[PDB]
Amino acid sequence: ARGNEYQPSNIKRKNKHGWVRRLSTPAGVQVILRRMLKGRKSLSH
Amino acid sequence: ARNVVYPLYRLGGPQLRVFRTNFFIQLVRPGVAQPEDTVQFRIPMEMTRVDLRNYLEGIYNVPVAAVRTRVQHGSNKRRDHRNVRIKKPDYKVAYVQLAHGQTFTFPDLFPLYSMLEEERQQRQSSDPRRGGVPSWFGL
Amino acid sequence: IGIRLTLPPPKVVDRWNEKRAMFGVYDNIGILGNFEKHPKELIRGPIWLRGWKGNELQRCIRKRKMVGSRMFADDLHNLNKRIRYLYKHFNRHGKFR
Amino acid sequence: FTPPIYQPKFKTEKEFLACTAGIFDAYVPPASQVSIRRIKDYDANFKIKDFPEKAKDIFIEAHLCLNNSDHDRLHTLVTEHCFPDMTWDIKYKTVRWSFVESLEPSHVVQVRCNVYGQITVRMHTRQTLAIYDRFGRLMYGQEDVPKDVLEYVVFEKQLPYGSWRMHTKIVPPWAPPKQPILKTVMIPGPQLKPEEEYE
Amino acid sequence: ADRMSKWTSKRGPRSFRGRKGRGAKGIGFLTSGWRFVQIKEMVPEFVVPDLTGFKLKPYVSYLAPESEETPLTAAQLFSEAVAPAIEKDFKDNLEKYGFEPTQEGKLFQLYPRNFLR
Amino acid sequence: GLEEFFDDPKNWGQEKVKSGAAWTCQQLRNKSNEDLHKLWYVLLKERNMLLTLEQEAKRQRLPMPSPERLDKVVDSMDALDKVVQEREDALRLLQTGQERARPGAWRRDIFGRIIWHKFKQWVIPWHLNKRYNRKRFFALPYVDHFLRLEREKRARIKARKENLERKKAKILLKKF
Amino acid sequence: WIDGPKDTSVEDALERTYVPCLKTLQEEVMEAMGIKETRKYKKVYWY
RNA sequence: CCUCCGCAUAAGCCUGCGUCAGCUGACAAUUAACAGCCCAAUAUCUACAAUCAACCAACAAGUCUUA
RNA sequence: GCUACCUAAGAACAGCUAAAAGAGCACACCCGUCUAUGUAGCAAAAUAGUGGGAAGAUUUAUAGGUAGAGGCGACAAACCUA
RNA sequence: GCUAAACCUAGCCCCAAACCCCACCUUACUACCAAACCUUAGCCAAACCAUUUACAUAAAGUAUAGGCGAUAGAAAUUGAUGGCGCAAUAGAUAUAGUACCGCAAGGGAAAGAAAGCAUAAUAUAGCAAGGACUA
Numbered sequence A: 001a002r003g004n005e006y007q008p009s010n011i012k013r014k015n016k017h018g019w020v021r022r023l024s025t026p027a028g029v030q031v032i033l034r035r036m037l038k039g040r041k042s043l044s045h
Numbered sequence B: 001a002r003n004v005v006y007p008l009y010r011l012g013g014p015q016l017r018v019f020r021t022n023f024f025i026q027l028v029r030p031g032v033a034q035p036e037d038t039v040q041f042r043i044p045m046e047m048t049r050v051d052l053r054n055y056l057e058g059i060y061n062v063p064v065a066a067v068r069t070r071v072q073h074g075s076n077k078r079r080d081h082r083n084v085r086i087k088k089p090d091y092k093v094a095y096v097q098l099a100h101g102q103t104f105t106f107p108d109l110f111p112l113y114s115m116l117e118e119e120r121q122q123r124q125s126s127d128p129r130r131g132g133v134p135s136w137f138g139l
Numbered sequence C: 001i002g003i004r005l006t007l008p009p010p011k012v013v014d015r016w017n018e019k020r021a022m023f024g025v026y027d028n029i030g031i032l033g034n035f036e037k038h039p040k041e042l043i044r045g046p047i048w049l050r051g052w053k054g055n056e057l058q059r060c061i062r063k064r065k066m067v068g069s070r071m072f073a074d075d076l077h078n079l080n081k082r083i084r085y086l087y088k089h090f091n092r093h094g095k096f097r
Numbered sequence D: 001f002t003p004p005i006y007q008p009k010f011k012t013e014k015e016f017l018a019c020t021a022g023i024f025d026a027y028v029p030p031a032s033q034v035s036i037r038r039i040k041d042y043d044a045n046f047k048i049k050d051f052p053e054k055a056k057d058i059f060i061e062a063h064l065c066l067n068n069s070d071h072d073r074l075h076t077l078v079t080e081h082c083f084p085d086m087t088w089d090i091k092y093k094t095v096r097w098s099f100v101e102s103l104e105p106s107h108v109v110q111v112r113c114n115v116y117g118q119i120t121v122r123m124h125t126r127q128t129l130a131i132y133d134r135f136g137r138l139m140y141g142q143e144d145v146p147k148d149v150l151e152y153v154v155f156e157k158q159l160p161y162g163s164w165r166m167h168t169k170i171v172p173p174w175a176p177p178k179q180p181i182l183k184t185v186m187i188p189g190p191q192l193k194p195e196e197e198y199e
Numbered sequence E: 001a002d003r004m005s006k007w008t009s010k011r012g013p014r015s016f017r018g019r020k021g022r023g024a025k026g027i028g029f030l031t032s033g034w035r036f037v038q039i040k041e042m043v044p045e046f047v048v049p050d051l052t053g054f055k056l057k058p059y060v061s062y063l064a065p066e067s068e069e070t071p072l073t074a075a076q077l078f079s080e081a082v083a084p085a086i087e088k089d090f091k092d093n094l095e096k097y098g099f100e101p102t103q104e105g106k107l108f109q110l111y112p113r114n115f116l117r
Numbered sequence F: 001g002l003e004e005f006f007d008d009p010k011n012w013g014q015e016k017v018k019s020g021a022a023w024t025c026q027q028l029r030n031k032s033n034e035d036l037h038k039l040w041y042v043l044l045k046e047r048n049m050l051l052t053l054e055q056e057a058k059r060q061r062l063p064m065p066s067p068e069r070l071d072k073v074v075d076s077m078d079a080l081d082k083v084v085q086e087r088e089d090a091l092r093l094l095q096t097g098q099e100r101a102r103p104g105a106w107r108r109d110i111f112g113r114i115i116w117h118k119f120k121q122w123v124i125p126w127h128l129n130k131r132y133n134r135k136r137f138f139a140l141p142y143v144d145h146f147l148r149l150e151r152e153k154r155a156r157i158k159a160r161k162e163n164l165e166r167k168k169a170k171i172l173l174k175k176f
Numbered sequence G: 001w002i003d004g005p006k007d008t009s010v011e012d013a014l015e016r017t018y019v020p021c022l023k024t025l026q027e028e029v030m031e032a033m034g035i036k037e038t039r040k041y042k043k044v045y046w047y
Numbered sequence H: 001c002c003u004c005c006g007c008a009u010a011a012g013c014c015u016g017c018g019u020c021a022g023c024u025g026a027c028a029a030u031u032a033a034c035a036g037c038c039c040a041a042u043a044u045c046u047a048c049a050a051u052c053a054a055c056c057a058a059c060a061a062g063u064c065u066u067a
Numbered sequence I: 001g002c003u004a005c006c007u008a009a010g011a012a013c014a015g016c017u018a019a020a021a022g023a024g025c026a027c028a029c030c031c032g033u034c035u036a037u038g039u040a041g042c043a044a045a046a047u048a049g050u051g052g053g054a055a056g057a058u059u060u061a062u063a064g065g066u067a068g069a070g071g072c073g074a075c076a077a078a079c080c081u082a
Numbered sequence J: 001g002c003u004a005a006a007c008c009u010a011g012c013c014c015c016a017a018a019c020c021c022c023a024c025c026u027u028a029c030u031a032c033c034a035a036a037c038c039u040u041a042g043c044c045a046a047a048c049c050a051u052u053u054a055c056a057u058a059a060a061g062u063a064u065a066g067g068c069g070a071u072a073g074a075a076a077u078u079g080a081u082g083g084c085g086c087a088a089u090a091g092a093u094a095u096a097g098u099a100c101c102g103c104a105a106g107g108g109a110a111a112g113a114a115a116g117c118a119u120a121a122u123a124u125a126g127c128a129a130g131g132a133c134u135a
């Protein structure tokens, strides 16, 4: 019954975790800054 | 041209001209049967079919009747020893139909060791009657 | 199996290199030089523990006091956490009271 | 309820020249002064009247080296074209080759010629052989009874620091058969496929 | 879910796939009815010269002499293009010698560059 | 004609093709603008032919005949481009004093990093450009801590590199 | 060395046809090829 | 002998049983008409469902621009 | 991106009986009454049969919204990525 | 005799010194349309908890503060390149912030140069041994 909580949709993916939304708020900008400091290859989703 | 900023055009402005073209194309043998008048090219991704028509008609004086393009996705499945995906580059493929009933067919391109070879000639393989006994000795 | 099967490469120690040969010179700089310089001024090391000694809590307090402003951000955070932890340990844990 | 814990996937995805090719002009047993000069002009010191002694010494010493498998010396004693013949079939078996006084004096036969020297020397000596197995059991030739050996040995030399080394032994077709082998041998006939028949 | 693969026009839904391109430069615009109007002046025109009678070749004979690289500089160009005329007129208003006060009014403006390659 | 995409028919199948030397920057600097313009297309046609050869060799699983001429042609075209760029840069410096063909400015992005923002061509002034005004070219105070952290990460990398270099030098001296 | 059909002769490769001028390759080639352009490039904004 | 199966579109995925030679590597491939990517503005306009829309039946009252 | 509720604009509902129905029987569809199986399973809640609704307070695709002492809730302390 | 065992530098730690072409904020990496600033809290200690505690040297743990209790706590004044480090389970998480896991924030690796069996199953009875015994 459970396990399939991920129902992929690129629109939701980008609107929820994308670069633009991350930069839309100071908290998201700090998310990006933390990923950059850690050296993540993928800063945003 | 590619990797260059195009001067922004406004109504009534001069024609956009490129003097030293940056596009380099390859004429490739089709992987599938094609009509006699179709020529297959691999093209830079930034090249339009209009650009390819003008390119072939100006640099090679090839009468072009039609041009079609498709973006072929290069496999991203292969992985190196570190489990990191190796991306085969995506590339643009153009199909150019020649005009005036002109026909094209891809040409049939591609139509110390002496000592080693002569020693292989002079191997002198051991005979079965020798039973593994070295035959070099003269006794 | 926790034993190496080959003798380690020979270790050759030059007991008479310059460092060993001149080790200890000027340790009596004071008593033999009219006390112009104290022997502790011969000590080369961290600025916060030149000519000084203490347990880890005191060392960390001194380090923060003397170079805390020059420390990297996460190193200073670690030092503050360590001082807090050591304070708790030394003042609340132990067999003796 | 407690969720299952998955172990990392990586743990379970793991997966595992100074030689010539033969003889420039083969000598056929039952005028080479140009080649003599062609070697003199490049060597600056040579004696045909004394070469046979040195050639015999090299031959005997190399054959003695074969006894102890002295490959380090054998490399310098024989050419690379000859070394595989010298040392391949004899691997994993002891040979007790020995030399005894010769029967007739060795003399040169003919010489020819980036540039590689070549001297053919005829020897009719007397030798002993005893080739054993890995297990030390004789398989060729008595160690005590000597045999007379007729050999046409061809030496090759590099023309700057190379020397005269055994290059190839010419066996004439009229030479007598070699010694018989102690052990018997079976020689399979033509293997037959299911659809084939013997004829 | 694939964060590492590059984002291309092959990935999203129909709208995404239509909207994203592959870097090809624009040629015109879209009017009502999604009718594409191609502007001729936006299309790069290849100014290909006449190669008939041209002596140069893709390769150079190895017999050519070696030389020392001397990258052209503004000073060198000025000496080789303007200094002669300046001297000849000084011995005997810089537009006469070539200088132009402003790039505006030219077809090929040097800055901001407005020509391809 | 499409025959220009292939080498001379006599060369088809040849194990090796004899080729000259790549044009050098100095050799090209002596040629006129028209001569360079024409040589560019000569080299372009040769490059297209060589790329076609490379691809057909890959297709046939055979070694490409004399691959070095492709490198020679690429080097020649790069030298020609460098020469033309040098001429354009010299002319631009003389006539305008600008060292860069494209307008740009040093700006601090939303992440506090100093970047060379290269300008883009627009039709409306920037204060009216909505998309442009969405882009932020300033860093708010919450970025200062991350700037310090990045600086200290760089410092740590540099310090490790320097100590490693010195230790390797010490080991070399001990060895010799 | 023997020049191939696609190798420039030494004299051709060394001929100094370059006349130091204050013209870009684009405008020089426009003049040489006789391409006539009367439309004036409308000004654009950079930022 | 068996199948609410199958074929398409959407969404998702992204080369993931095409060829070749040794699961790996190389080579090839999906070609726009379908679909997406639109619209020059200012204003002024636009009461009258749908249900085969014609009767009949209502209530829950229902995507509606020219100068 | 599950789920609860909501917003926008969509879509589906055979056949028979009945007539404009939170109507009857019953497909698709939705659910999950009872039994058996399964219980490291096909499945971190399934299978087979049986059963409830099936033109509605229905089901459902798409996009958007509500956020943690908060949301949402036909109150089960239900749900808010097992 | 199998599996295996081993290895030494890849690097790291702590100091000192020194201040360190093109594309991309729209669905990022897409050529081109009319707006920031604002007390940290709490864990924890007080054996609960509620005020409180808990984000050079010397003067001095002094004056002071404090459910005057846990505890907190001055100032005047004084003047000041190296390694008894690690050496691949260590040392950085690091071969890499990669693979992989997660919708997301985020988490985050591994690695390079004996045991177990087989030769050779097993004998009444038993913490498997000990005293022994010719055994």
Ligand SMILES: [Mg+2]
Binding pocket: A007
């Ligand atoms: Mg869903």
Ligand SMILES: [Mg+2]
Binding pocket: B069, B070
């Ligand atoms: Mg298409």
Ligand SMILES: [Mg+2]
Binding pocket: none
């Ligand atoms: Mg019905």
Ligand SMILES: [Mg+2]
Binding pocket: I023
């Ligand atoms: Mg009903």
Ligand SMILES: [Mg+2]
Binding pocket: I074
């Ligand atoms: Mg409900």
Ligand SMILES: [Mg+2]
Binding pocket: I075
């Ligand atoms: Mg209740």
Ligand SMILES: [Mg+2]
Binding pocket: none
């Ligand atoms: Mg209850």
Ligand SMILES: [Mg+2]
Binding pocket: J045, J046
């Ligand atoms: Mg307490």
Ligand SMILES: [Mg+2]
Binding pocket: none
């Ligand atoms: Mg004080």
Ligand SMILES: [Mg+2]
Binding pocket: none
């Ligand atoms: Mg480690």
Ligand SMILES: [Mg+2]
Binding pocket: none
């Ligand atoms: Mg064992």
